[PDB]
């Protein structure tokens, strides 16, 4: 059985630069003068999209900046000039033997300049308070790089164990990320405190940024 | 041109059966060399599982070979059946067309993919709460306590897509999912322009339209 090893696992490159991905097969995929290796692009939430077939043939409708090369067991996918919309996971796939296995994938990220996040804080809706639970949401918007820290404070007391975070994929419009943090409290505990703060630490901030609101205002 | 529409996904029970269908439009199913099913576990890679050729010949991945693929030229549709479903079968299933030239097993035409969740838990509809705003303003919707995945969120019936951020869902300790979708709009438009988030949860036939108003 043919096994594929993609390399690297992930990379970060500036926009417009050249990107090179490699795929290594456990045995040869050459037959009848052709190399049965294919390349795919898969963007977040979308189906895989064929880029290269038979090692080096460009699929119709695919931008010319994608190209493939190689033979036997070693193959190469090249993006001559990385564009913001090329953020995706790229797969190689051999079409020589059942079960036509895919590589494990290579994550390509665009490395842009540092961007500080825009912080927004939302109080729980009065409709949710009828259920006995309060959800305070803090939004970190359009920042780079991906690393960021959120620290909840209820009446200046730092919180722990009662929040969950979620980060989006890189946005091709911006090459930035966004983060959503939800603090979960009971209605009784929410009604017993005044100041709800969201402290944000990021590389693009000389000092930590703190957004807050007063309950009942 | 050629469009591949999948159906039959959603919540299925362990040990039960799965029956997916891939409807082909703008294209006769007899014109493709082969039709394939390819699945992708959440956070994992791609795995080809089945194929059927124009001559009726079928083939399967030996890692799953409790699987049946069929083809109905009259209905212009091919199917995928799987029984003895396990937890490993939870994946996004794609249908893809084979090839005529330069090999037959590279796939250029794909379906949209449907998520199959193998679980004995019960389907639960979400509660949609607004994230009201206080240059640029931010607002959103909090989709909370639903099962299983997925939930599709749009803003103003799809008219508003720029600056929209629908975050990945989080698995809460209660065993239910919860996500939020936010959007950045100009602050001068909060009084004139309305903002309705459209939350759709197909496994529970839940479709909620909540209007986010400034408090």
Author numbering:
A (entry chain L): 1 to 217
B (entry chain H): 1 to 65, 67 to 135, 142 to 222
Please give the exact wording used by the authors of the publication that reports this structure:
Immunoglobulin E (IgE) plays a central role in the allergic response, in which cross-linking of allergen by Fc∊RI-bound IgE triggers mast cell and basophil degranulation and the release of inflammatory mediators. Omalizumab is a clinically approved anti-IgE monoclonal antibody that binds to free IgE, also with high affinity, preventing its interaction with Fc∊RI. Instead, the Fab alone selectively crystallized in different crystal forms, but their structures revealed intermolecular Fab/Fab interactions that were clearly strong enough to disrupt the Fab/IgE-Fc complexes.
The Leu158Pro mutation alone was not sufficient to prevent selective crystallization of the Fab, and the structures reported here were the result of unsuccessful crystallization trials of the complex between FabXol1 and IgE-Fc. The FabXol12 structure (2.5 Å resolution) contains four Fab molecules (FabXol12A–FabXol12D) in the asymmetric unit. In this structure, the packing environment of Pro158 differs from that in the FabXol11 structure. Again, the β-strand inter­actions between Cγ1 and Cκ domains are disrupted, but new packing interactions involving Pro158 are formed. In this manner, Pro158 mediates light-chain/light-chain interactions between FabXol12A and FabXol12C, and between FabXol12B and FabXol12D. In molecules FabXol12A and FabXol12B, the heavy-chain CDRs adopt similar conformations to those in the FabXol, scFvXol and FabXol11 structures. By contrast, the CDRH1 and CDRH3 conformations differ in molecules FabXol12C and FabXol12D compared with the other structures described thus far.
